[PDB]
Design a protein around this nucleic acid. Sequence first.
RNA 1: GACCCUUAAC
RNA 2: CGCGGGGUGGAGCAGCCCGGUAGCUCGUCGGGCUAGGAACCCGAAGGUCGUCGGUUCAAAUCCGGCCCCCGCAACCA
RNA 3: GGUUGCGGCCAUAUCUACCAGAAAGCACCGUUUCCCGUCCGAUCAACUGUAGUUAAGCUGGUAAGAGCCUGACCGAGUAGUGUAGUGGGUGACCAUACGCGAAACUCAGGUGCUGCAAUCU
RNA 4: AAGACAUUGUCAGGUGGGGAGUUUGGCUGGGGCGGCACAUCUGUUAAACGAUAACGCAGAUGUCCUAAGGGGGGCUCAUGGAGAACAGAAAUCUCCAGUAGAACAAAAGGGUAAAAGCCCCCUUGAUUUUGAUUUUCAGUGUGAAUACAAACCAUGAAAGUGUGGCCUAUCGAUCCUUUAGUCCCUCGGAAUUUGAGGCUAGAGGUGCCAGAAAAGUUACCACAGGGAUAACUGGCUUGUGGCAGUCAAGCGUUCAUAGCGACAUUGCUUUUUGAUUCUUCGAUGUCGGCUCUUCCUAUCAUACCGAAGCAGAAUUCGGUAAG
RNA 5: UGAUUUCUGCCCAGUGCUCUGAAUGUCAAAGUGAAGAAAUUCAACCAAGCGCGGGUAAACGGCGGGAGUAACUAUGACUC
RNA 6: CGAAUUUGGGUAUAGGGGCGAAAGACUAAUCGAACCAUCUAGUAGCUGGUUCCUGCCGAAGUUUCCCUCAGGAUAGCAGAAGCUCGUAUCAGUUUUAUGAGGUAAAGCGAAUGAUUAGAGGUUCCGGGGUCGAAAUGACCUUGACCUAUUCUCAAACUUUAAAUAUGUAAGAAGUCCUUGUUACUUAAUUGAACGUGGACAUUUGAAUGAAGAGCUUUUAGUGGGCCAUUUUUGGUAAGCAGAACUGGCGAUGCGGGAUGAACCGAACGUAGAGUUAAGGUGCCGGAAUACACGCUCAUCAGACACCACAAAAGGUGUUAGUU
Lengths: 58, 159, 103, 218
Amino acid sequence: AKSKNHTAHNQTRKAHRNGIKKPKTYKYPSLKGVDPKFRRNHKHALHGTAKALAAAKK
Amino acid sequence: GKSHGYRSRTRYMFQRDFRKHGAVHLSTYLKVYKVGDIVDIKANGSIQKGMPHKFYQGKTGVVYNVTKSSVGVIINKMVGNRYLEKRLNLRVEHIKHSKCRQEFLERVKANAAKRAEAKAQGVAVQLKRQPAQPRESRIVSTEGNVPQTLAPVPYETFI
Amino acid sequence: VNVPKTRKTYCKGKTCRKHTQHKVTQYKAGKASLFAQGKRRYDRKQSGFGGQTKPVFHKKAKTTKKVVLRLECVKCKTRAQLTLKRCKHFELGGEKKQKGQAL
Amino acid sequence: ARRPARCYRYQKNKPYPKSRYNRAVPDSKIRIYDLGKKKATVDEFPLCVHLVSNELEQLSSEALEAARICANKYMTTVSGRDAFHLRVRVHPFHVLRINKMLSCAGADRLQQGMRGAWGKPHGLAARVDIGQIIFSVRTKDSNKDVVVEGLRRARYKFPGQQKIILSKKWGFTNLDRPEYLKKREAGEVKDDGAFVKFLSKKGSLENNIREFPEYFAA
RNA sequence: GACCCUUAAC
RNA sequence: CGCGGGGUGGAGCAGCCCGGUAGCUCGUCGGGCUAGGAACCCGAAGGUCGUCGGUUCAAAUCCGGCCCCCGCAACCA
RNA sequence: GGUUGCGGCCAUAUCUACCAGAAAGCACCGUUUCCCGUCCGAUCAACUGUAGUUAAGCUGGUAAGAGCCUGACCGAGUAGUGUAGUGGGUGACCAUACGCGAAACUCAGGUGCUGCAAUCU
RNA sequence: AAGACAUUGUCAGGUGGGGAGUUUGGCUGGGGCGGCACAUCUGUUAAACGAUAACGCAGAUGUCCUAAGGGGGGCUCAUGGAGAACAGAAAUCUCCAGUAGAACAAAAGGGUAAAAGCCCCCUUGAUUUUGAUUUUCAGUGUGAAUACAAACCAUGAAAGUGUGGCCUAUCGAUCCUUUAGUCCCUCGGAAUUUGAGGCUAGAGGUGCCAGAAAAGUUACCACAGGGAUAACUGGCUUGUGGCAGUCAAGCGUUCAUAGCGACAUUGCUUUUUGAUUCUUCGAUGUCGGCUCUUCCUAUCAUACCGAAGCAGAAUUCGGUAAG
RNA sequence: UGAUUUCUGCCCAGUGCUCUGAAUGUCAAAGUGAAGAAAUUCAACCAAGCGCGGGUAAACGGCGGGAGUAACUAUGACUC
RNA sequence: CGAAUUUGGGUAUAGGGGCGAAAGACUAAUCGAACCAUCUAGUAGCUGGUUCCUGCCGAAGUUUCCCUCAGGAUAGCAGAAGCUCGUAUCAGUUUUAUGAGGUAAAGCGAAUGAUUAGAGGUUCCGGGGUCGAAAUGACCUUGACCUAUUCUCAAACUUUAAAUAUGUAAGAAGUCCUUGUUACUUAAUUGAACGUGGACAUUUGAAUGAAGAGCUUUUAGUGGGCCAUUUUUGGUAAGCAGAACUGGCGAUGCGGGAUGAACCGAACGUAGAGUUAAGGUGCCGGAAUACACGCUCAUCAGACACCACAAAAGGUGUUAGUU
């Protein structure tokens, strides 16, 4: 017995019930996937700023 | 059987152009992309490395990573009932700066400039854009412009 | 396909750690040892009454195997393996391809 | 025999031309498309009568041949073979397919039903639109009744409704009658084989003087 | 060792 | 209207352990035997290999179309 | 404004055939000892600033030029099409309402523009 | 009589449908046969984002390549025009013209001209380590692989480029075996040397391709079900079947239409057969005949009539008409 | 197989069945053959069997095509 | 119907066993493997059933994988429980700006591929002749060498190219300083990234709305679908098979289409009044046998979308109109 093969009928309606919300955005995205050379250097630069800031507001 | 390869249904999408084949003009390699820049994706069919998938043709995203020849682009893709964050490693030939983005930045500076001029005198500059408004009343003079009367034409063959 | 008998490639031997020359040989699967644990367990399971106790494959579909090149570094004797694509004809004897010759 | 024209009258499928993906198609029933005094000149036949369609449909090559032979034979027998020029302005380019059902015995035992029902070519048709000319006749003004009657006779060979409409252009030209004469009084129109060439204001003037000499020579 | 045949046409 | 093989001189077979630009037998022809036939002996000719289109390492053998010789399956309500 | 070198957009720049080019500038160019690959100092390499060559390259002009580009109430609100009716029509299809709106065609106009560093009576 | 043979006991090969147990894919316009739409790739269907079905259409894959990979350099291709002593339509050789009309392993589509094509030189980046990403997607696996990082390299003057093939296909889990990886860890009463077992990365393969180890027959048959699905009627359809019409080239002795009627073309009918699968598989008794009633008309006969190639007879065509 | 009568043709290639024994053919336990330490590969007119050879159809069973040819045609005794 | 006869009693053979002059026959109404008990409440993706009320919310027949196709797992759709604030950083929408697309249309005197006709010359093999190779010979025929036209086309053609649909942006995580940091990067305080201090609430940088945002856990059912309009494939077609978007039916009553899952109208707590929708208003039947202008007479009139059909072709029947 043959059945129905495929239809996207009702699929858009289902996807809109509690649906298509955009992904929540953040300040400070994850530094994964960015260049390690930039990541390694960024770690040193952020460290110095925290030390530099701490000295200023001692 | 069915066929769904990486570049299926890309015959005209990835076609180069009419009288625009061959080597790419070098200004595309002179453009600079920073993290946060809004870029468009238009795949160049001559350059086969760092090629976006056909889904991403015409998609506009944000740069998150800058490598030797490529930029990481974040693109929101609709998967089912929600958008998923996709990360594209695209060579520069397949992207260009969004022009609307650059236009809005000029508005940001123009809005700040207009605020500076108005703040000198307080004239309620109203930076906010407005929709096209319904027309105000006007008077149409007839001198030299006498109305010319029109009628429906009769039917005729013209063959 | 035709693969040379020597191949300068990266060696990880804690002494080279660089590109050095290798001798190139085909991999041979080695004789299945009696007294390997799987055979010891299998021989135990096959003993006595019950028949065949494990599956026996019959639905063979590949007409080709993958050729594995074993590489011995000529510097530090550290051996290495790499696998090639499926090929119906493999030769290590490198008879170079000549371009502009008549038949 | 041939399956009735009612089965292919209307435009249901996309244009299906003979091609490298078809590569095996029956020949068209109509091979001749120019009749009467075809070698004539545009000044010889000032009157044009059009047989036009009022339906978006398909005409088989067989109906085109029947209408053509009928229209030609009446004009020749009434007014002479070389007193007119008739040109059928549609060519059958769409091939019609048939899913050959068996009229043998034990048909359902090996018919497979609608499985693999993609049909084989068995005919050719021309896809015409509302207001598209099927037949055009070039003739003299004193032969209007004769060539209108020939197209009336040929209307019976086509399905659907057709209009016999008089052209306001001289012969097979694109210019109206009185627009043709002014272009003809000047040396702007030169007789080609059966059609004519036109003097254009553009191009190299050296060529435009070598031809159309009467236009420049006063 | 092998070796078949022979004009209708005075 | 499905699945398979095959098509090379007048006739029957050789390119099927991927290639001698086509060979071997019968038939035919010429000569010789014999007082002519036959049988026998000595020589010769005969097909660009069903047709069309594909790699261009002598490609057409092996690939894809149409025709022809056929063969098997054509059932259970 | 000419020219050279490096460019950007990549024919408004291309193509055909003629006409013109002062100074500046390729090279008419000339040579093979040297670095440099071959049958060939033709290309390529190197060496010179010569009789003084604008013949060619190149640039510009021309042509009811081909092409290309720009524009148009030119075709044309046409083709097409989003939405609508218990509109019409046996049907095929069509008309109408609220919107969007081509391409051919025709007619004009246009013969690259321009950045950086030099150089030039 | 027979004899350390036989026999008996144990183990080990052979034989063994006599017997036992089990199995004997899926999709599918019913199932079978056929095919593969079962893992894939190109173009189209596909309705200009993406997705998108049918046993839709036109095709392709399980390979091939130490170069057909990498780098660099030099050079232009197909094809037409222009000559020659045996040189011719095809051997060269030389100029022209030539946007690619060539070639690039294959299918197809893209892409590529001082190259991605063709020739030359040097090479193995088709290498190490392990992460991030894209496509199918559950955002799992597999296959491809896009961009980097940390090494080692190749090439090039250098910028750079190179982590296989110009891009889109070209493929494989658990368990077991085996190989490679400083005797690294363990063999648990303590040791030493064999053996075995571990950790990391490959191979050996599952094509029904996320991967069972598998022959039939049943007309002696069984069970759970299915109108999710065939074999009647009925319904939609009407290709085919049957029956009409329009046009009028022609036939009918010199006349289309008395009677016909090609090429076309419009229909009607469901007294054919297909197509479909809607109803019925907790069952609607199936072929034919016999019997019997009624209905239809597309009239064979009988009533009246029109027409004729109706001079009579006999026919033929048509009308009203199913009494 | 199926009274009697008259007969019972050809085929042992295949599948069986059966008969045979040169084994630079295959070949199980046991047994016999290297060296430190042993658990641990072999060879062997290696047993039968299988392979090799023969018989057997009143065993199972099987038992062909193409083309040409007779002086009217047709056919084909004949012929490849 | 005198025997291979019929038959009583005794006896023997017992279930994968017996017995069989053979039918899978017979073996206590059981036989293609008896009967009895037990294992055993055997397993069942299959059929049937599944017990009170009201209230609120409220589906799916779709994705991927599976010897998967009448089943599962997974995701989706749904419920429940909530958890983190005194104006929610959002939206099945528009606008503005900016992209992307190869469909419709168009085009083919534009490439590719088709395709109808006529317009010059030229023995570069062959079809033929005034004259006989008569030398490139006062001719036409494939054109074996040439451009200007011309009719008609394409799902797997295309320069062009819509409509609809579609990506992004329209700011407080935003904008304007000689570095503040770094081991990255640069020739270089050059940049890159992230920062400290400074300048910006009724306009916080379009419109409209926002019904509270955002977030988590867990779990049910479902995983047979079907029907309009429009686009669309196979098919002659189908109340046929298969896709796209949407709306529906399934899950839904109500008014209308007589009647009907889907059409039109409108979605539903219990009542009342008033208006309506769609559809109607001669009578059935509530509502004008109203008003107004025409047209039609049928010895088969016509009479309302889906929808329950009719065509080509004809008619001095009738009406209007064009020449």
